[PDB]
Design a protein around this ligand. Structure first.
Ligand SMILES: Nc1ncnc2c1ncn2[C@@H]1O[C@H](COP(=O)(O)OP(=O)(O)OP(=O)(O)O)[C@@H](O)[C@H]1O
Ligand SMILES: Nc1ncnc2c1ncn2[C@@H]1O[C@H](COP(=O)(O)OP(=O)(O)OP(=O)(O)O)[C@@H](O)[C@H]1O
Ligand SMILES: Nc1ncnc2c1ncn2[C@@H]1O[C@H](COP(=O)(O)OP(=O)(O)OP(=O)(O)O)[C@@H](O)[C@H]1O
Ligand SMILES: [K+]
Ligand SMILES: [K+]
Ligand SMILES: [K+]
Ligand SMILES: [Mg+2]
Ligand SMILES: [Mg+2]
Ligand SMILES: [Mg+2]
Lengths: 527, 527, 527
């Protein structure tokens, strides 16, 4: 209904490119081992110092609406790359800027930008297939330490402590990063668990940074069925509210008036409470229910063998824990006060049931339940002299954990932008169907040099000469930008997770090649 | 009451034409296989990239009131075409601009624009009759795939998946479109049902995009009698709202107090509920309610043989569903948790009843009932790397489904604007009753070239030469604008639904020829 | 108490004339068969395209308050003509402007404007008497179709469908107009009724356009007495609102707290109820009340014989009415779901009491009962491709029904402004009492040529030559402005209702001749 401004063609495209260029120029200075940091003013408290690309991209909004559209699209690129990979957001930003620039340069009257986008997506699929061909799996703890060191801006202690954490709790174990009070980082092994069900309502969030629910020393209330009626929840809520510990309800499906009562009590008087769906289906859900009820030292409600009701809930049937974290991705329960002999009896029963399984799917879930109650979780405490230092370091530790998980999942390729450089002959062999698809393929071919050029540019040398020397070199040779030398990248440990590279390329290509199809931009008139 | 500005004659008409020209210029760049996209700034979140003409038209409002009047009239054209056909909104926009421009050019002292509008309507009726003579029915699935491919901007995978969906669930089956988490699209066959009754009141909408109601894992309280009385709904409401679930109440006529209380609780505390009228009239109605009660696994209330009241409602007597989508046009129910034995018993009872029916009207209703309960629905998940790409692709998938349903309903004509080009000799034979009707007929005669001209213009060639070569060609020959050639359009599959073409022409002609009769424009003084 | 601006004499009169001229110039372009339309911006939704004079007059307010006074006086003229005649508002506007202009020109130091107004009144009385002499009654359905065709801007199908409606339901039958979902207009005869009772409390409106109360499937709680006790009616209102349907109350007198409480609760919770008085007087009212109870299929309350209480309301005592339109002029109930056998028994009883009655005073009302119970109500659906087209056409259908009803009531005269032209010799024979009355008589004599001049001017020819030729012609000859010829206007069907002509002249003359007596204008200072 508000009045709009409509711009056409080249002028609108140049304004959107100005926004893209501003955000990408801010992000690109943080790339590689000689990248520098960005200081972001906060409304409350101290400014934030970061090297993280999506953090810089999310903090930049522009007054000019036409520039802000391009800034928001590159912000979408960085956020999507952060969501499905956890690393590589700066690479995705510079790739998206390169694709948008090359697409805007190649638009004429006879050009078909939608078919150019088709050629871009075909070229990116070819590059991703070549990246999967080039990938090799991680087999050693040394490779894990190398991935974590590279992803932490060359910090070898971060790599060492992440490698030690995955040596203790396993390559698929739960690792947690929080603040540290000391000067140095430290690794702690504690009894905790984590399942793959987040929150249900978005109104249980108090920590505004990670968008997670952080309660400490909480009450735990399990259920087999759904804790449903008002007469079945007013006792539970009244005892769990009067007693000074927050409530964690584990139910099946929570969407309704008990949930809205929880939201309203959080709003008005501040009731600390959360409701979580129960992971697993069939008897696996009930077995994990019993496992968590024993581990928390509480009780199972609405079951079949006891028929315990929720109208008579006693204070001795609620589990006591020392921390619960409810992200939208997972739920995490640390330092339960369950009975030690009960946990040992449950682990002996799980061993007895492990001895009598041969179906290769029941045994996998039984081993998962065995490694939940016994292997424990790892907690990384990040040290530093101030909150701004600790937050800056925590960004890199989170990046390194995400990259190491990605590398365990999907393997490793050469670092320093060389993995994308070695996929250019995969695009040389392609046969385009028309001129527009050839334009798109050549756009991707030019874009593949951008990460290595950006790393070399931040190191203070001429990136085009570096990239030309790499392309003229053998496939194992690349540019150590920290030492300023052409080395064997795998031997020197300058390696990247394959998932991160292909994620950054795909997420940049889709959004940027869609943006380059635009003829008309409609914005709201600024009041 | 507010002060007004009154403008007369040619100046007011030129201002309204400026508004029409701005909106139609923004819409026209998206037309045909070489059309480009439009980016629309959203107040919240990411900008929207679209090729949809009605979406571009709806997003444009102008500060100048006189321009905004013309913009709103072309908005009416595009919205009406979208509402009655689902496709062809860009064609209707450019036809409306052409009619408004030619009508404004032909206004003089002696001209009678109401009689010119009469001539325009007569010419449009003649063109529609010629289009109906031109139309041929769809008989093959290859034609189905061709319609869906053309309507999806030449995307052949969209055409293939829509053809496969209509192979599985039938050419009149229920197909829905939602988001996909993956890169690629996917088709699934999900058990469910859809009936043709919308909501009762417009305060049941949370999704602000489609103006629909999307609830998940709900319960259904259905009654043959009207669920009316406060003492007959409030116990049922308390049992249904206590339990954490959404609610679907199905009744006959709901026009007083109960859902007003439901709306009041929705506004205050967040009551998730919807109330829907019951399809059918008489024995067909109660048959459908029994069928959906069996499908959802609940109970029938207010019946005549069991005499079950709405006061005594138990939690086991309501139907468990996994999704409900309530639009104004229709309502649908997805993944009912009804018992499988009673569903198979109901389908056997339907077969047994169909064995003893020969009235050719109850048979059709019973076949509709077995297609509700057994044939299932198709769900298309649209894939992509980001929400902006997914929404842009979802627009084209929705357009392709709408066009394919239109083509099943009313047949197909030539694509590329050639179908309207072949109705010009139908206007040559007309005999106008006076000079003003001849002016209107000639306005429509020049307007019929506009769609093919616009498609050729967007392809980067001279539209007038292309259209002239099309008239000099045989009736089966037209311009493939994607390949830039003159081809047999039926053999190459460049075809359009007849309903879409005639709907776009009618909706453009009516509004634009009413606009061209204006001598005086009254607007509000801007504060 | 606010500060005022006071203007004197010729300057104030010229500013008021500027406002009159602006509004009349906007209205006058819509006059006659070659009139053009006016587009009015609406704050919500689409603009309104109209040919209706009072609609244009009501939409124009001026910032200059001196101009706005004249604009609002001509708006009063148009509104009064629309209220009593239902047509002829453009004629009344141009007549009022002519009288105001001629009166302002003739004001000097020795002129007495009040005596000029007296001469205007005497001249208008003479013209109205001559119009009544010239009038002839309508005797054929062809004349009915001709009146409805002329009043619908020459639309012959509107005239035909109105003539068919009055053939089916009678020349005094109930005909309504609503929207059509199709392209063409449709006529339907359905069961219903209408009684002339304006609803007492004016705060039961749900449609802002027609100022009508439009309810769907309301309940009928009809009673003969004054609906008095709140302890009696609160159960009844609670049952009616709580059975999920609206309520219609038939009362004797409502001037207190329960109706105000219903209005206030409508404002708070949104219950739907209307209260109207009962047609008839005495036992006629009770007989009609029994008739409406039988028609609506409900139950009579507060009757003298049974002494039935308003507390005891059965779940089916409230009758069902399927369409409620209660304007500020009348009340009207359609699609009453009454017992068909009871309705046939009631009409048999009415026939049995028809067969012997010889009073012709209550027998006329009993004949009205016979023509109210079963002769039916005509409904016209107006078709079109868009809401703006449908509303524009609905304005003309409403004008045509109003004019045809007026012509049935009071006869027909020549159209095209010729009827007023043939009353100029009636003013020639007048003998004024002084010079000021002579001035007023000459003002009306010059004004009588204005409608024919305006119709000829809108047709693109010179109006004064046309009027001079008409005055030089025989009494049956006038100007067909549509064909641009001089014809026998009765045989060509260009006729006007006598009531419309005399109402437009009287309503223009009174207000405009009162306006021309002004020496001083007092306005508020604009803040
Ligand atoms: N010593 C090095 N020599 C060459 N390249 C290196 C070296 N150390 C790291 N790199 C490369 O630098 C890149 C990582 O840079 P950086 O961590 O700043 O950005 P990102 O991973 O794209 O984004 P972000 O960390 O902001 O989410 C990888 O390509 C990595 O291989
Ligand atoms: N390869 C092609 N060659 C020629 N004409 C084509 C080709 N592909 C599609 N068309 C034509 O393009 C038109 C469809 O264009 P488009 O889908 O952009 O607009 P629309 O259907 O009018 O509106 P909208 O899709 O925005 O609601 C049809 O007339 C169709 O026949
Ligand atoms: N073909 C015609 N030739 C001459 N006069 C005509 C013709 N058709 C209609 N008229 C005259 O035009 C006048 C009606 O004009 P119009 O309907 O535009 O205005 P109105 O009735 O004064 O007001 P409104 O319809 O706006 O309430 C009548 O005097 C009618 O006789
Ligand atoms: K970085
Ligand atoms: K389009
Ligand atoms: K008029
Ligand atoms: Mg990194
Ligand atoms: Mg289309
Ligand atoms: Mg009229």
């Amino acid at each position: 209904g508000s009045a709009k401004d409509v711009k056409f063609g080249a002028d609108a495209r140049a304004l959107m490119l100005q926004g893209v260029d501003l955000l990408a120029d801010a992000v690109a200075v943080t790339m590689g081992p000689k990248g520098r940091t960005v200081i972001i003013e906060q409304s409350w408290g101290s400014p934030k110092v970061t090297k993280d690309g999506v953090t810089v991209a999310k903090s930049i909004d522009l007054k000019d609406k036409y520039k802000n559209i391009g800034a928001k699209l590159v912000q979408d690129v960085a956020n999507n790359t952060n969501e499905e990979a956890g690393d590589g957001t700066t690479t995705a930003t510079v790739l998206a800027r390169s694709i948008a620039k090359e697409g805007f340069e190649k638009i004429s009257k006879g050009a078909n930008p939608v078919e150019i986008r088709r050629g871009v997506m075909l070229a990116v699929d070819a590059v991703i297939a070549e990246l999967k061909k080039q990938s090799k799996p991680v087999t050693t703890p040394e490779e894990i330490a190398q991935v974590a060191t590279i992803s932490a801006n060359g910090d070898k202690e971060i790599g060492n402590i992440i490698s030690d954490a995955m040596k203790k709790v396993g390559r698929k174990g739960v690792i947690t990063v929080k603040d540290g009070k000391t000067l140095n980082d430290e690794l702690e092994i504690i009894e905790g668990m984590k399942f793959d069900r987040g929150y249900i309502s978005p109104y249980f969030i108090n920590t505004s940074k990670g968008q997670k629910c952080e309660f400490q020393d909480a009450y735990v209330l399990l259920s087999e069925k759904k804790i449903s009626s008002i007469q079945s929840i007013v006792p539970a809520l009244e005892i769990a509210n009067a007693h000074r510990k927050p409530l964690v309800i584990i139910a099946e499906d929570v969407d309704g008036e008990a949930l809205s009562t929880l939201v309203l009590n959080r709003l008005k008087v501040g009731l600390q409470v959360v409701a979580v769906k129960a992971p697993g289906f069939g008897d696996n859900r009930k077995n994990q229910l019993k496992d968590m009820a024993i581990a928390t030292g509480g009780a199972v409600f609405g079951e079949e063998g006891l028929t315990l009701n929720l109208e008579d809930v006693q204070p001795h049937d609620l589990g006591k824990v020392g921390e619960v974290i409810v992200t939208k991705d997972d739920a995490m329960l640390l330092k339960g006060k369950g009975d030690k002999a009960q946990i040992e009896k449950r682990i002996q029963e799980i061993i007895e049931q492990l001895d009598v399984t041969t179906s290769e799917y029941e045994k996998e879930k039984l081993n998962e339940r065995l490694a939940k109650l016994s292997d424990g979780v790892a907690v990384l405490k990040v040290g530093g002299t101030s909150d701004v230092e600790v937050n800056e370091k925590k960004d890199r530790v989170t990046d390194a954990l995400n990259a190491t998980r990605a590398a365990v999942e999907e393997g490793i390729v050469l670092g320093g932008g060389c993995a994308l450089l070695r996929c250019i002959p995969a695009l040389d062999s392609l046969t385009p169907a028309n001129e527009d698809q050839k334009i798109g393929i050549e756009i991707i071919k030019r874009t593949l040099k951008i990460p290595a050029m950006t790393i070399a540019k931040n190191a203070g040398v001429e990136g085009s000469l570096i990239v030309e020397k790499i392309m003229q070199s053998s496939s194992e040779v690349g540019y150590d930008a920290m030492a300023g030398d052409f080395v064997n990248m795998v031997e020197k440990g300058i390696i990247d997770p394959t998932k991160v590279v292909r994620t950054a390329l795909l997420d940049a290509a889709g959004v940027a090649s869609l943006l380059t199809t635009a003829e008309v931009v409609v914005t709201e008139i600024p009041k």
